Design an enzyme around this catalytic site. Structure first.
Site, PDB file in Angstrom:
ATOM      1  N   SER A 178       0.774  -1.207   0.000  1.00 39.50           N
ATOM      2  CA  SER A 178       0.000   0.000   0.000  1.00 39.50           C
ATOM      3  C   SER A 178       0.816   1.272   0.000  1.00 39.50           C
ATOM      4  O   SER A 178       0.491   2.207  -0.736  1.00 39.50           O
ATOM      5  CB  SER A 178      -1.012   0.014   1.124  1.00 39.50           C
ATOM      6  OG  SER A 178      -2.091   0.896   0.832  1.00 39.50           O
ATOM      7  N   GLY A 179       1.862   1.292   0.786  1.00 37.46           N
ATOM      8  CA  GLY A 179       2.635   2.554   0.842  1.00 37.46           C
ATOM      9  C   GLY A 179       3.898   2.591   0.027  1.00 37.46           C
ATOM     10  O   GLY A 179       4.630   3.580   0.047  1.00 37.46           O
ATOM     11  N   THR A 229       1.932   3.668  -8.051  1.00 36.07           N
ATOM     12  CA  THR A 229       1.224   4.572  -8.988  1.00 36.07           C
ATOM     13  C   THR A 229       2.172   5.561  -9.557  1.00 36.07           C
ATOM     14  O   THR A 229       2.268   5.744 -10.777  1.00 36.07           O
ATOM     15  CB  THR A 229       0.038   5.337  -8.352  1.00 36.07           C
ATOM     16  OG1 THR A 229      -0.475   4.694  -7.207  1.00 36.07           O
ATOM     17  CG2 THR A 229      -1.064   5.569  -9.399  1.00 36.07           C
ATOM     18  N   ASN A 280      -0.563   5.645   2.617  1.00 33.02           N
ATOM     19  CA  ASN A 280      -0.352   6.603   1.568  1.00 33.02           C
ATOM     20  C   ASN A 280      -1.433   7.694   1.668  1.00 33.02           C
ATOM     21  O   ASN A 280      -2.388   7.560   2.432  1.00 33.02           O
ATOM     22  CB  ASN A 280      -0.383   5.984   0.206  1.00 33.02           C
ATOM     23  CG  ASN A 280       0.307   6.812  -0.811  1.00 33.02           C
ATOM     24  OD1 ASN A 280       0.618   7.939  -0.508  1.00 33.02           O
ATOM     25  ND2 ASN A 280       0.529   6.267  -1.996  1.00 33.02           N
ATOM     26  N   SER A 311      -3.498   6.485  -2.115  1.00 30.17           N
ATOM     27  CA  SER A 311      -3.352   5.073  -2.384  1.00 30.17           C
ATOM     28  C   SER A 311      -4.236   4.577  -3.474  1.00 30.17           C
ATOM     29  O   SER A 311      -5.365   5.007  -3.620  1.00 30.17           O
ATOM     30  CB  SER A 311      -3.553   4.259  -1.160  1.00 30.17           C
ATOM     31  OG  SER A 311      -2.785   3.055  -1.214  1.00 30.17           O
ATOM     32  N   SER A 312      -3.695   3.670  -4.288  1.00 33.54           N
ATOM     33  CA  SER A 312      -4.424   3.061  -5.399  1.00 33.54           C
ATOM     34  C   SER A 312      -5.380   2.012  -4.841  1.00 33.54           C
ATOM     35  O   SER A 312      -4.969   0.988  -4.313  1.00 33.54           O
ATOM     36  CB  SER A 312      -3.448   2.402  -6.355  1.00 33.54           C
ATOM     37  OG  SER A 312      -3.655   2.910  -7.668  1.00 33.54           O
ATOM     38  N   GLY A 341       0.701  -6.583  -3.994  1.00 36.31           N
ATOM     39  CA  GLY A 341       1.443  -7.751  -3.722  1.00 36.31           C
ATOM     40  C   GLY A 341       0.940  -8.380  -2.500  1.00 36.31           C
ATOM     41  O   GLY A 341       0.275  -7.742  -1.702  1.00 36.31           O
ATOM     42  N   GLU A 346       0.103  -9.576   0.646  1.00 35.01           N
ATOM     43  CA  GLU A 346       0.078  -8.928   1.939  1.00 35.01           C
ATOM     44  C   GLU A 346      -0.558  -9.936   2.893  1.00 35.01           C
ATOM     45  O   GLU A 346      -1.474 -10.728   2.582  1.00 35.01           O
ATOM     46  CB  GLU A 346      -0.627  -7.565   1.929  1.00 35.01           C
ATOM     47  CG  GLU A 346       0.417  -6.448   1.609  1.00 35.01           C
ATOM     48  CD  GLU A 346      -0.016  -5.046   1.924  1.00 35.01           C
ATOM     49  OE1 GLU A 346      -0.821  -4.550   1.009  1.00 35.01           O
ATOM     50  OE2 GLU A 346       0.413  -4.437   2.905  1.00 35.01           O
TER      51      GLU A 346
END
Lengths: 372, 643, 372
Positions: free
Chosen positions: B79-80, B84, B138, B141-142, B364, B366
């Site tokens: 996530s972080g 993107t 983030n 975040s995407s 990915g 997680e």
């Protein structure tokens, strides 16, 4: 707390397992002592193929499995299937990991030396419990009623016993076992109730005869002039409503079922009955201890719960005992869990810590260590 | 761990680990994306230049024209990690180094709607308003995955693009954690830079009026909702959307807010739900081109079709609130999907295409103490992606030993993972059992569970019954993925997987005055034929039977596209949860490394002949050793040289 | 999608075929289960000589062909003529090529092992389908009503059945078959309507008695004081206009026709009727499962569509069942396609993929493979 919270108490029976944490007032887990093995290949919706079933899932699904009882008459007869019931108890019923909990187990009255060593072998070597202890069942029942000398009439699902105990040591040569208990008793009611002109045809009819036995059965004192009473037909009768409407009536047979415990002849048994056996245990003991045993007849077990069991026993042994004697039949209300509660007390006790068999004792002394 | 760390404390964010291109979040600004660099990395093998993303990105291009094969770039991280950012940055790269619309190049509204190179670009900022949000990790975040196909021409100049979206976080639309927030759009719009909008949508500027969107946070200091609103706005236009559509989008995005304001009450002496007012419904109704009443009925007295007819069913208060939420989400999603399509549509040119370069951005593997359905879907995606690599490497490796003449035999490295994959995707595997039970009108999560076991337990190795304790929250089933053991909780799955929607309402949508809204629903309206009576199979009429039935289909269409490609890998990393440049928590980076594939690439390397030098990367660094004879070798034949 | 779109569902009946794609809500194709063979040599204008006719072209042209029904009472009796109906279904009705579509088929309740193997032999060896599967009809009907345990009263054109199902397994020894259905029922109406003083003389008179049965027939509750009602002559009567003007009136007989399903004696049948048979199925099952079956009487089939069928059945079995029981007669609206819809659901399902019998299974295991 380490183990104050942490001690487990597992009472293995012929019909039911009672389990929970030392400290609690009653068993956290109570369930049938069965292990079902599916007769056919297939699945329930959403589940995978299951090799085995234990407790209530084995009872509920009994039509597609071959049911087996690991404990015949209080003694463990199949060790593959018992390790299965233990596994279920720890992991599913109490949901604990066993390798950090001391485990107090119970065994039967003249449990073969080799068995007490085998369940120790399985407790320590396949479940890896920190420490364990095996108490004798009558002995925990007595102790849960406060005392240390008395004689326990213990009666559950497959066995009845009389275990005279003196300052804690159960007396091997005076113990009596009568293989007629609540299981035998449900099947006899069954017949005197079909014989009343009925049919327990589907499995939903079979199972509930047992719930009739528990709810409506009685042990009358003067079972003689109770049959006589039945005939004049008083408002002694009692109708139970089945899974559906089918209101079945049971007047009389209601007490003809526990009269089986005093008269085994009702069921083609030639053995003596509960009260005579209490007594015979007692005239097999030392002379000087017989006043003690007589004033301390402690009752435990599911089948000793029939109301008026104590009054009948009271009068049954007064009238066999020398009149110079004091008779006293203690029957507590929680008696279907006496055994368990006695274990809960004992194992949560402040002084018991020094009798726990630890893996240190075991890895060093072999199964012999706990065997005593 | 230590190498990464050291070159980071020195401010080097790009370090390679085999084929990978590790990237660490700077957490500050760098002259790297520098317009000088871009050129520098232009026409250079990765041995002629230091570790950097443009290396990967250029080589792709090169390779593209050199080998006449299509390419791919797989960006992945938590996530972080900041993917993107990279993705975008890669994209610019392509656009720059191979554009030339000739006419579109002039400084006259350059990059505005009316050119792609721009459209291509402009794409992002729209999607981002709708599929991005402030995560606790983030700030942008995407909340979805993506795959772009940049279709290069014959010459080598840009020709087309192609987006595809995967797994959108539908839940944000209705929920939000305490430190997070929903999609930007909402906050963009209520920012007030375009006041008409507020009155047009019939809302206020205070988000606390819209429960759905202010459960968490409303404002983020690093974001200027006002600026974005335009960015967004302008992008739409460039993207070629019709004003009307551009109007639908907005109007539609507000309806959704309103829905969450829709309130109900128990009818007296009845357990039925009855509308608690026609204040909001009115707005939602109008904004969607609906009728207030018809709407509230359908909602309250859902008219179903059990048997061969249509049976009117009554709902509870709790049932409504939940159904509403289901549409809110449903609608948003679809829309989002549509936007993408529409984008794609503009991004469609007539010019010939010979090859493309796929840029894949997804999450990915997680691991959470709590792993639900969504986790499985993602993990599964990754465990596949991994095998995809392990193989490419096996293929690749084996060429060297063939080129050199070494005698090394070895089995495909992918193979190790086939076990796990089969268990999930194969016929009597998880998904199936999952998607079958979804057909049983009276199945339970519990039901499903048992079916899962009876069939896989004891018989399957990768299949296991959970470890309920540690940092985990409950028990159901663990799997043995390459990265490790994941403890999965099966609760809601059945539902989530059924995508239950009140068909009466959908009906209304289907006949809206707002064409766009009408459109979005069409595909539901065309499969109803197929699931006419109670029970049965939705697919008969083209309706989804599984929540998972597509995911798979899409994931296949993808992994297939990935194959006719020359895979190029990029692994994005996140230094410290605390957001500090030049720092790194160990175990945190360590984690990523395992789940990344980095540690597995090292393994496979070390089997054997650990360190493996790429030829140019070999020349440069060591020419100096027999300087005359090693330089000649390296220059004379990039490979023959090192020899 | 490969097969998400691609699964076919074909429900073979005694009167109608129902067919279509798994996924759809209702059958794409519904047509008579006939195969006509021309009695004379000749042609229609513009066509060639046709050896055979199937479905509606066989019905429409019945005057020059000998009509034959391949499925007698739900069981396939002629395999040459069945392969003809399948051929027609794939190639003309659904217009698909079968060799790229998985095919879910249905069979009847106690369908002979050998038949399930034979239609598998014909599906894989003469139609070359990728994969197939045979579901039992009552079982798909139940499942389409959401549940997994219940008892289905299934009634179509040539057979009626009761199939008690428990957690998905249809119970072989409790299944009952009553050979009186909608076909029998149209012919009885026919006579009580000619007996009302009428004539169904030409074939355009014959066919429409069946459309009278479907549109105007009723199952009255208290069929007793409904005849009584008929006599006082209320506005209970109902006139239907024939292909032409000839307005025929049907007041009373309207319900005398479905009273045949409760009283087979109306038609010289000595068998028991629908409600008693529901019940007898149920007192043939295990005891513990009888409360489940009683609260889940699912109805499916064209002949169970007569309005008020459910209310009559509701009261028919309440009054035979023990009052302690919960009765519950589920009759959904789409019931003339329950079977099919249950197949559409199941075959489009996410978990069914792993039960499809593939040509790999077949070419390797013989017809035995799918037979289970």
């Amino acid at each position: 707390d380490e183990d104050e919270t942490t001690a487990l108490v597992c009472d293995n029976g012929s019909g039911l397992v009672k389990a929970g944490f030392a400290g609690d007032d009653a068993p956290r887990a109570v369930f049938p002592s069965i292990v079902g093995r599916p007769r056919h290949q297939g699945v329930m919706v959403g589940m995978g193929q299951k090799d085995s079933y234990v407790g209530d899932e084995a009872q509920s699904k009994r039509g597609i499995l071959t049911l087996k009882y690991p404990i015949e008459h209080g003694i463990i007869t199949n060790w593959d299937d018992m390790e299965k019931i233990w596994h279920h108890t720890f992991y599913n019923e109490l949901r604990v990991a066993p390798e950090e909990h001391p485990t107090l187990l119970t065994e039967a009255p003249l449990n073969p030396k080799a068995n007490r060593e085998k369940m120790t072998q399985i407790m320590f070597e396949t479940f890896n419990v920190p420490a364990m202890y095996v108490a004798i069942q009558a002995v925990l029942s007595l102790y849960a009623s406060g005392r240390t000398t008395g004689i326990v009439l213990d009666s559950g699902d497959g066995v009845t016993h009389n275990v005279p105990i003196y300052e804690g040591y159960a007396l091997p040569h005076a113990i009596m076992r009568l293989d007629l208990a609540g299981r035998d008793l449900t099947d006899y009611l069954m017949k005197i109730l079909t014989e009343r002109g009925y049919s327990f045809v589907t499995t939903a009819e079979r199972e509930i005869v047992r719930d009739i036995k528990e709810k409506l059965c009685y042990v009358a004192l003067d079972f003689e002039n109770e049959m006589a009473t039945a005939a004049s037909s008083s408002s002694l009768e009692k109708s139970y409503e089945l899974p559906d409407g089918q209101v079945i009536t049971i007047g009389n047979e209601r007490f003809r079922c526990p009269e089986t415990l005093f008269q085994p002849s009702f069921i083609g048994m030639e053995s003596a009955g509960i009260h005579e056996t209490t007594y015979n245990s007692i005239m097999k003991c030392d002379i000087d201890i017989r006043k003690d045993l007589y004033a301390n007849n402690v009752m435990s077990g599911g089948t000793t719960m029939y109301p008026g069991i104590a009054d009948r026993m009271q009068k049954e042994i007064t009238a066999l005992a020398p009149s110079t004697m004091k008779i006293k039949i203690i029957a507590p209300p929680e008696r279907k869990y006496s055994v368990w509660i006695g274990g809960s007390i004992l194992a949560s006790l402040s002084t018991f810590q020094q009798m726990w068999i630890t893996k240190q004792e075991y890895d060093e002394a072999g199964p012999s260590i706990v065997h005593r | 761990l230590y190498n990464l760390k050291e070159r980071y404390a020195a401010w080097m964010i790009y370090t390679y680990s085999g084929l990978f291109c590790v990237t660490v979040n700077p957490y500050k600004w760098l002259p790297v994306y520098n317009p000088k660099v871009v050129l520098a990395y232009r026409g250079k093998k990765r041995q002629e230049a230091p570790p950097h993303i443009f290396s990967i990105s250029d080589n792709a291009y090169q390779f593209m024209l050199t080998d006449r094969e299509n390419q791919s770039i797989l960006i992945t991280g938590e996530s972080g990690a900041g993917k993107t950012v990279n993705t975008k940055r890669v994209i610019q790269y392509f656009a720059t180094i191979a554009a030339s619309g000739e006419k579109k190049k002039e400084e006259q509204s350059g990059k505005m709607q009316g050119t792609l190179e721009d459209q291509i670009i402009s794409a992002n900022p729209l999607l981002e308003a709708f599929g991005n949000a402030k995560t606790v990790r983030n700030d942008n975040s995407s909340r979805f995955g993506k795959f772009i196909r940049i279709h290069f021409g014959a010459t080598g100049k840009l020709a087309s693009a192609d987006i595809e979206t995967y797994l959108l976080e539908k839940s944000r639309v209705t929920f939000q954690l305490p430190a997070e927030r929903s999609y930007h759009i909402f906050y963009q719009i209520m920012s007030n830079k375009k006041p008409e909008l507020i009155d047009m949508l019939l809302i206020t500027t205070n988000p606390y009026d819209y429960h759905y969107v202010s459960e968490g946070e409303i404002t983020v200091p690093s974001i200027d909702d006002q600026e974005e609103l335009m960015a967004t706005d302008s992008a739409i236009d460039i993207l070629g959307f019709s004003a009307d559509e551009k109007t639908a989008i907005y109007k539609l995005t507000g309806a959704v807010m309103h829905y969450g304001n829709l309130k109900f009450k128990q009818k007296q002496r009845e357990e039925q739900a009855e509308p608690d007012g026609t204040e909001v419904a009115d707005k939602a109704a109008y904004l969607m081109g609906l009728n207030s009443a018809e709407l509230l009925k359908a909602l309250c007295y859902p008219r179903v079709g059990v048997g061969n007819e249509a049976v009117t069913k009554g709902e509870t208060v709790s049932e409504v609130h939940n159904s509403v939420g289901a549409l809110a989400k449903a609608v948003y999603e679809k829309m989002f999907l549509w936007m993408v399509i529409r984008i794609n549509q503009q991004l469609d040119t007539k010019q010939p295409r010979q090859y493309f370069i796929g840029v894949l951005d997804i999450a990915g593997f997680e691991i959470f103490d709590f792993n639900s359905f969504e986790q499985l879907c993602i993990n599964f995606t990754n465990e596949k992606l991994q095998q995809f690599f392990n193989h490419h490497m096996f293929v690749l490796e084996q060429e060297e030993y063939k080129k050199e003449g070494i005698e090394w035999e070895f089995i495909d490295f992918g193979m190790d993972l086939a076990a796990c994959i089969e268990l999930i995707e194969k016929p009597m595997g998880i998904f199936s059992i999952l998607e079958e039970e979804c057909m049983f009108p009276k199945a339970t999560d519990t039901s499903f569970k048992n079916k899962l076991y009876d069939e896989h337990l004891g018989k399957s190795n990768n299949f296991q019954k959970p470890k309920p304790a540690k940092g985990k929250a409950e028990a159901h089933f663990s799997l043995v993925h390459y990265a490790g053991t994941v403890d999965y909780n099966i609760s809601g799955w059945l539902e989530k997987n059924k995508d239950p929607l009140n068909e009466t309402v959908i009906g209304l949508y289907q006949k809206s005055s707002v064409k766009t809204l009408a459109l979005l629903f069409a595909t539901y309206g065309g499969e109803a034929e197929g699931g006419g009576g109670k029970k049965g199979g939705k697919k008969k009429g083209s309706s989804f039977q599984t929540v998972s039935a597509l995911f798979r289909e899409n994931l296949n269409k993808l992994m297939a596209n990935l194959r006719s490609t020359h895979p190029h890998f990029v692994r994005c990393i996140i230094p410290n949860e605390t957001k500090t440049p030049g720092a790194m928590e160990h175990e945190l980076v360590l984690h990523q490394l395992r789940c990344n594939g980095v540690l597995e690439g090292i393994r496979i390397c070390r089997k054997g002949f650990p360190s493996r030098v790429l030829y140019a990367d070999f020349k440069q660094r060591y020419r100096v050793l027999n300087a005359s004879a090693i330089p000649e070798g390296q220059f004379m034949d990039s490979k023959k040289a090192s020899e």
